[PDB]
Design an enzyme around this catalytic site. Structure first.
Site, PDB file in Angstrom:
ATOM      1  N   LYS A  50      -3.974  -4.871   9.170  1.00  0.00           N
ATOM      2  CA  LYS A  50      -5.092  -5.756   8.743  1.00  0.00           C
ATOM      3  C   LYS A  50      -4.716  -6.518   7.453  1.00  0.00           C
ATOM      4  O   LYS A  50      -5.531  -7.298   7.004  1.00  0.00           O
ATOM      5  CB  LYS A  50      -6.347  -4.888   8.564  1.00  0.00           C
ATOM      6  CG  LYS A  50      -6.896  -4.239   9.838  1.00  0.00           C
ATOM      7  N   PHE A  91       7.945   0.134   4.807  1.00  0.00           N
ATOM      8  CA  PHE A  91       9.035   1.064   4.395  1.00  0.00           C
ATOM      9  C   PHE A  91       8.487   2.502   4.410  1.00  0.00           C
ATOM     10  O   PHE A  91       9.047   3.368   5.147  1.00  0.00           O
ATOM     11  CB  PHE A  91       9.596   0.646   3.024  1.00  0.00           C
ATOM     12  CG  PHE A  91      10.133   1.726   2.113  1.00  0.00           C
ATOM     13  CD1 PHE A  91      11.275   2.426   2.435  1.00  0.00           C
ATOM     14  CD2 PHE A  91       9.559   1.956   0.877  1.00  0.00           C
ATOM     15  CE1 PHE A  91      11.790   3.384   1.575  1.00  0.00           C
ATOM     16  CE2 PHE A  91      10.069   2.914   0.022  1.00  0.00           C
ATOM     17  CZ  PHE A  91      11.180   3.633   0.373  1.00  0.00           C
ATOM     18  N   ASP A  96       7.615   7.784   6.830  1.00  0.00           N
ATOM     19  CA  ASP A  96       6.588   8.854   7.010  1.00  0.00           C
ATOM     20  C   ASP A  96       6.486   9.273   8.501  1.00  0.00           C
ATOM     21  O   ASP A  96       6.172  10.448   8.738  1.00  0.00           O
ATOM     22  CB  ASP A  96       5.228   8.443   6.434  1.00  0.00           C
ATOM     23  CG  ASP A  96       5.169   8.515   4.904  1.00  0.00           C
ATOM     24  OD1 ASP A  96       6.157   9.015   4.275  1.00  0.00           O
ATOM     25  OD2 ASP A  96       4.136   8.056   4.354  1.00  0.00           O
ATOM     26  N   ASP A 100       6.861  13.070   9.917  1.00  0.00           N
ATOM     27  CA  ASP A 100       5.642  13.692  10.518  1.00  0.00           C
ATOM     28  C   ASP A 100       5.844  13.971  12.017  1.00  0.00           C
ATOM     29  O   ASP A 100       4.936  14.602  12.633  1.00  0.00           O
ATOM     30  CB  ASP A 100       4.429  12.761  10.497  1.00  0.00           C
ATOM     31  CG  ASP A 100       3.893  12.457   9.120  1.00  0.00           C
ATOM     32  OD1 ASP A 100       4.490  12.971   8.141  1.00  0.00           O
ATOM     33  OD2 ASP A 100       2.895  11.679   9.032  1.00  0.00           O
ATOM     34  N   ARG A 105       1.666   4.409  15.896  1.00  0.00           N
ATOM     35  CA  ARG A 105       1.337   3.712  14.620  1.00  0.00           C
ATOM     36  C   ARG A 105       0.719   2.352  15.009  1.00  0.00           C
ATOM     37  O   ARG A 105       1.301   1.642  15.900  1.00  0.00           O
ATOM     38  CB  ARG A 105       2.616   3.627  13.774  1.00  0.00           C
ATOM     39  CG  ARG A 105       2.560   2.632  12.620  1.00  0.00           C
ATOM     40  CD  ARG A 105       1.738   3.098  11.440  1.00  0.00           C
ATOM     41  NE  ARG A 105       2.291   4.307  10.855  1.00  0.00           N
ATOM     42  CZ  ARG A 105       1.657   5.113  10.005  1.00  0.00           C
ATOM     43  NH1 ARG A 105       0.442   4.822   9.575  1.00  0.00           N
ATOM     44  NH2 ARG A 105       2.256   6.205   9.551  1.00  0.00           N
ATOM     45  N   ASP A 167       2.706  16.464  -0.946  1.00  0.00           N
ATOM     46  CA  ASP A 167       1.983  16.615   0.340  1.00  0.00           C
ATOM     47  C   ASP A 167       2.781  17.579   1.214  1.00  0.00           C
ATOM     48  O   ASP A 167       2.237  18.645   1.570  1.00  0.00           O
ATOM     49  CB  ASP A 167       1.755  15.232   0.985  1.00  0.00           C
ATOM     50  CG  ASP A 167       0.779  15.301   2.162  1.00  0.00           C
ATOM     51  OD1 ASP A 167      -0.149  16.182   2.165  1.00  0.00           O
ATOM     52  OD2 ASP A 167       0.996  14.493   3.064  1.00  0.00           O
ATOM     53  N   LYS A 193       0.147   9.382  -3.717  1.00  0.00           N
ATOM     54  CA  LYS A 193       0.639   9.014  -2.362  1.00  0.00           C
ATOM     55  C   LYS A 193      -0.018   7.715  -1.877  1.00  0.00           C
ATOM     56  O   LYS A 193       0.689   6.946  -1.183  1.00  0.00           O
ATOM     57  CB  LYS A 193       0.429  10.133  -1.339  1.00  0.00           C
ATOM     58  CG  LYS A 193       1.216   9.937  -0.047  1.00  0.00           C
ATOM     59  CD  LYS A 193       0.917  10.951   1.054  1.00  0.00           C
ATOM     60  CE  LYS A 193       0.983  10.337   2.441  1.00  0.00           C
ATOM     61  NZ  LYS A 193       1.609  11.235   3.439  1.00  0.00           N
ATOM     62  N   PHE A 232     -11.629   5.850  -0.966  1.00  0.00           N
ATOM     63  CA  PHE A 232     -11.071   5.254   0.276  1.00  0.00           C
ATOM     64  C   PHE A 232     -10.512   6.372   1.164  1.00  0.00           C
ATOM     65  O   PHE A 232     -10.842   6.436   2.369  1.00  0.00           O
ATOM     66  CB  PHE A 232      -9.968   4.250  -0.038  1.00  0.00           C
ATOM     67  CG  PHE A 232      -9.262   3.707   1.175  1.00  0.00           C
ATOM     68  CD1 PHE A 232      -9.876   2.767   1.990  1.00  0.00           C
ATOM     69  CD2 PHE A 232      -7.994   4.153   1.521  1.00  0.00           C
ATOM     70  CE1 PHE A 232      -9.232   2.261   3.111  1.00  0.00           C
ATOM     71  CE2 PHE A 232      -7.352   3.651   2.646  1.00  0.00           C
ATOM     72  CZ  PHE A 232      -7.974   2.707   3.439  1.00  0.00           C
ATOM     73  N   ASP A 236     -11.489   7.912   4.747  1.00  0.00           N
ATOM     74  CA  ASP A 236     -10.408   7.993   5.766  1.00  0.00           C
ATOM     75  C   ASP A 236     -10.451   9.359   6.469  1.00  0.00           C
ATOM     76  O   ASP A 236     -10.385   9.393   7.722  1.00  0.00           O
ATOM     77  CB  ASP A 236      -9.047   7.797   5.099  1.00  0.00           C
ATOM     78  CG  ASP A 236      -8.221   6.697   5.728  1.00  0.00           C
ATOM     79  OD1 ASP A 236      -8.464   5.505   5.363  1.00  0.00           O
ATOM     80  OD2 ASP A 236      -7.349   7.037   6.577  1.00  0.00           O
ATOM     81  N   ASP A 237     -10.562  10.433   5.676  1.00  0.00           N
ATOM     82  CA  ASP A 237     -10.531  11.855   6.122  1.00  0.00           C
ATOM     83  C   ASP A 237     -11.839  12.209   6.836  1.00  0.00           C
ATOM     84  O   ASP A 237     -11.769  12.917   7.887  1.00  0.00           O
ATOM     85  CB  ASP A 237     -10.278  12.829   4.954  1.00  0.00           C
ATOM     86  CG  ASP A 237      -8.963  12.515   4.190  1.00  0.00           C
ATOM     87  OD1 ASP A 237      -8.220  11.590   4.606  1.00  0.00           O
ATOM     88  OD2 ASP A 237      -8.732  13.161   3.136  1.00  0.00           O
TER      89      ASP A 237
HETATM   90  C1  LIG Z   1      -6.857  -2.061  -0.614  1.00  0.00           C
HETATM   91  C2  LIG Z   1      -7.440  -1.867   0.638  1.00  0.00           C
HETATM   92  C3  LIG Z   1      -6.882  -0.962   1.537  1.00  0.00           C
HETATM   93  C4  LIG Z   1      -7.467  -0.764   2.794  1.00  0.00           C
HETATM   94  C5  LIG Z   1      -8.624  -1.467   3.194  1.00  0.00           C
HETATM   95  C6  LIG Z   1      -9.213  -1.283   4.410  1.00  0.00           C
HETATM   96  C7  LIG Z   1      -8.621  -0.817   5.526  1.00  0.00           C
HETATM   97  C8  LIG Z   1      -9.421  -0.710   6.634  1.00  0.00           C
HETATM   98  C9  LIG Z   1      -9.091  -0.278   7.879  1.00  0.00           C
HETATM   99  N1  LIG Z   1      -7.809   0.099   8.065  1.00  0.00           N
HETATM  100  C10 LIG Z   1      -7.294   0.755   9.281  1.00  0.00           C
HETATM  101  C11 LIG Z   1      -7.183   2.275   9.061  1.00  0.00           C
HETATM  102  C12 LIG Z   1      -8.429   2.797   8.713  1.00  0.00           C
HETATM  103  C13 LIG Z   1      -9.352   3.097   9.715  1.00  0.00           C
HETATM  104  C14 LIG Z   1     -10.603   3.611   9.379  1.00  0.00           C
HETATM  105  C15 LIG Z   1     -10.935   3.822   8.040  1.00  0.00           C
HETATM  106  C16 LIG Z   1     -10.019   3.521   7.037  1.00  0.00           C
HETATM  107  C17 LIG Z   1      -8.765   3.010   7.371  1.00  0.00           C
HETATM  108  P1  LIG Z   1      -5.596   0.058   9.580  1.00  0.00           P
HETATM  109  O1  LIG Z   1      -5.700  -1.515   9.128  1.00  0.00           O
HETATM  110  O2  LIG Z   1      -5.263  -0.005  11.160  1.00  0.00           O
HETATM  111  O3  LIG Z   1      -4.592   0.849   8.844  1.00  0.00           O
HETATM  112  N2  LIG Z   1      -9.991  -0.225   8.885  1.00  0.00           N
HETATM  113  C18 LIG Z   1     -11.311  -0.620   8.663  1.00  0.00           C
HETATM  114  N3  LIG Z   1     -11.642  -1.062   7.380  1.00  0.00           N
HETATM  115  C19 LIG Z   1     -10.702  -1.098   6.407  1.00  0.00           C
HETATM  116  S1  LIG Z   1     -10.809  -1.580   4.790  1.00  0.00           S
HETATM  117  C20 LIG Z   1      -9.170  -2.370   2.272  1.00  0.00           C
HETATM  118  C21 LIG Z   1      -8.591  -2.569   1.016  1.00  0.00           C
HETATM  119 CL1  LIG Z   1      -9.350  -3.711  -0.046  1.00  0.00          CL
END
Ligand SMILES: Cc1ccc(-c2cc3c(N[C@H](Cc4ccccc4)P(=O)(O)O)ncnc3s2)cc1Cl
Ligand SMILES: Cc1ccc(-c2cc3c(N[C@H](Cc4ccccc4)P(=O)(O)O)ncnc3s2)cc1Cl
Ligand SMILES: Cc1ccc(-c2cc3c(N[C@H](Cc4ccccc4)P(=O)(O)O)ncnc3s2)cc1Cl
Ligand SMILES: Cc1ccc(-c2cc3c(N[C@H](Cc4ccccc4)P(=O)(O)O)ncnc3s2)cc1Cl
Lengths: 343, 343
Positions: A50, A91, A96, A100, A105, A167, A193, A232, A236-237
């Protein structure tokens, strides 16, 4: 989204990123094959995310620099340094995924799992890192912030590698030990990390490109951005397990993979010894009923509730940090990010 | 040997190299475990060679700088930058050993083959690379050559990674193809994979540390040093097979490993189609009688003779290059190296 808009011009620039990195075939016929390979590595591993991290460099540059100093060549360099962040991330990901033993990916066969690649992917990952410094020399060597950006990328690399170490020590896959899965330790892993490279690095890059090189400025911004980074990863978790898979864009394997996830950490702070055992039983096995059995225990300890409360408290804390530490940057720098992740 | 002498002070300094790289435990209690791991990586992978590359930095510094500018702190930095070269080499070796599936290095279990390490060795290798830049910031950030050294190490990294790519494309282990094993291609692999980092890098480092930053100076030195690098590796390849193992300090597996060795390259330039087949049969198999059978064919094509002639012609060519391109460096800079490798 100020992001939605500049996304076009960012992805189009990649074509040029590549053209330049592969231009020394005209230089040196000898190494052509290797450069062909490098093209393949870039095309496969840098495209398909993204580009949140990369775009943040460009968006922040626009917000930080008086529009009078935003000429065609200045924007070229913002584009390039954003791509440099994406290449750092590429990278880390290729490497990673080998460590893992991951299979996919961004919904795609991991590079190292491709026919005829395998552990050659290690050199491939090293090239991706190299490419950062090639781009910085090619586009920024004449600029006053040149050295500042090299030091930033290198430090960011080191902070991430340290986090990766911590980790790997904490979560040996094939070793179910929950005693090393502590809040102090979860927080440290995230900080080194994920948080530096994902939040601090791209904003700090924009700041140096804007003539904002002061140590207090960078310290202030760091204080805000490392805390955003913490939230963030915690989200994610949470969403690895409770996230709607069609929403998120992924189905979570954190339980099977014996991860030091915010969820287990909270689970452990709360469990009675009976519950410690059910988990000690089920955490880190591939069996769908020994994974339903953790999810159920997380549910029975109302962790979705614990998260919602954390998400509220965290939102208040970030807004206070922005009031205190944003000046003299436009609060919009921080608020734009805070909105992408609290979405 | 000007080398034999300074070897003591070099290896003693390693103790300090480590103390400093591990001093941020006092800084940050959180990351201690990771730093412990980093200590283990350094102690295991940086010690145990002959430190020819590292020492060359120190020896060249002494020869290039008027003795009046050789204070305690200047020598500290020469020691440190020599160690930086050894750490670059250690990074490449740990990673090359995973990719080659090698079992031993400097007569010792390869790091990645140690119980509880495996592919974690990939992050370990990345840390070794990082450590170069940490040392350069810690010892040289205030010096006028600081940026020059960062660019040199990074470029050296990139040249080596390119060479590694070219090699991996040329010699897929499990793929006996001799048509890609050409002189042009052998020469390129050596230049990028071995010669830059082993010969140019350490002398170029000493030159920058001495206020010799001019592009023509560095071009001249490069012309001499890349040719020394070519001979070194060709001798490496000769002695893998014909080297007395108690002399060399190793027994050669180049034939089993389907290497693009100078020997096969010459063998192919000389063979009749009958002979092409005997080789096509035997090159790259583990069977001791299909490896005796190549050695015998090399012998029957008098390649030990071809080498002796190459070693003579090569010695004349290096001495001519030193006459032409050494000035205004002390020819001793070059002659000291030429004597270690023509020994
Ligand atoms: C610095 C920064 C880092 C990451 C984000 C975001 C990432 C991301 C995402 N990323 C997916 C992974 C992800 C899924 C669900 C929740 C968080 C991350 P992917 O693009 O496939 O890695 N999927 C929905 N929303 C978002 S917002 C935004 C910022 Cl400003
Ligand atoms: C900088 C900034 C940060 C956050 C917001 C908002 C977020 C959010 C939300 N977020 C949900 C979660 C949430 C609940 C409580 C407090 C914050 C976020 P979700 O879509 O599930 O991430 N749900 C309703 N309303 C809102 S307004 C808006 C801005 Cl301008
Ligand atoms: C820049 C430079 C690079 C390398 C050298 C030499 C290395 C080496 C060696 N190296 C061993 C390997 C090797 C064995 C036989 C022939 C060449 C290399 P090792 O120290 O265990 O890697 N064994 C005997 N003699 C030598 S001279 C010298 C310099 Cl002035
Ligand atoms: C800079 C310099 C370079 C080379 C030398 C010498 C090398 C060598 C030698 N080398 C043998 C091989 C060799 C044969 C012919 C020409 C050069 C090297 P080896 O010990 O097997 O490497 N065998 C007898 N005598 C010599 S003198 C001396 C210096 Cl003052």
């Amino acid at each position: 989204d100020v992001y939605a808009q500049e996304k076009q011009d960012f992805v189009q620039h990649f074509s040029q990123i590549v053209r330049v990195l592969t231009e020394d075939e005209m230089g040196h016929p000898e190494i052509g094959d290797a450069i062909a390979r490098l093209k393949e590595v870039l095309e496969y591993n840098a495209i398909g995310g993204k580009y949140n991290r990369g775009l943040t460099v460009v968006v922040a540059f626009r917000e930080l620099v008086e529009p009078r100093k935003q000429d065609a060549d200045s924007l070229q360099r913002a584009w390039t340094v954003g791509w440099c962040v994406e290449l750092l991330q590429a990278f880390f990901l290729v490497a990673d995924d080998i460590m893992d033993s991951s299979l996919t990916r961004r919904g795609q066969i991991c590079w190292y799992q491709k026919p005829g690649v395998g552990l050659d992917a290690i050199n491939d990952a090293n090239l991706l890192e190299a490419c950062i410094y090639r781009l910085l020399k090619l586009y920024c060597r004449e600029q006053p912030y040149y050295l500042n950006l090299i030091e930033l990328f290198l430090q960011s690399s080191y902070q991430t590698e340290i986090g990766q170490t911590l980790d790997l020590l904490t979560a040996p896959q094939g070793n179910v030990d929950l005693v090393r899965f502590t809040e102090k330790r979860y927080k440290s892993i995230v900080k080194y990390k994920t948080a530096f490279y994902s939040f601090y690095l791209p904003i700090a890059a924009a700041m140096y490109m804007a003539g904002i090189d002061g140590e207090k400025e960078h310290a202030n911004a760091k204080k805000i951005l490392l805390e955003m980074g913490e939230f963030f990863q915690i989200q994610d978790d949470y969403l690895d397990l409770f996230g709607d898979p069609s929403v998120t864009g992924k189905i979570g394997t954190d339980i099977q993979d014996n991860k030091c996830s915010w969820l287990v950490v909270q689970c452990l702070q709360r469990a009675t010894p009976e519950q410690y055992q059910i988990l000690k039983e089920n955490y880190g096995q591939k069996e769908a009923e020994k994974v339903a059995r953790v999810k159920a225990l997380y549910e029975e300890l109302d962790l979705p509730a614990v998260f919602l409360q954390y998400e509220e408290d965290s939102y208040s804390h970030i807004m206070a940090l922005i009031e205190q530490y944003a000046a003299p940057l436009p609060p919009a720098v921080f608020l734009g990010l805070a909105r992408k992740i609290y979405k």
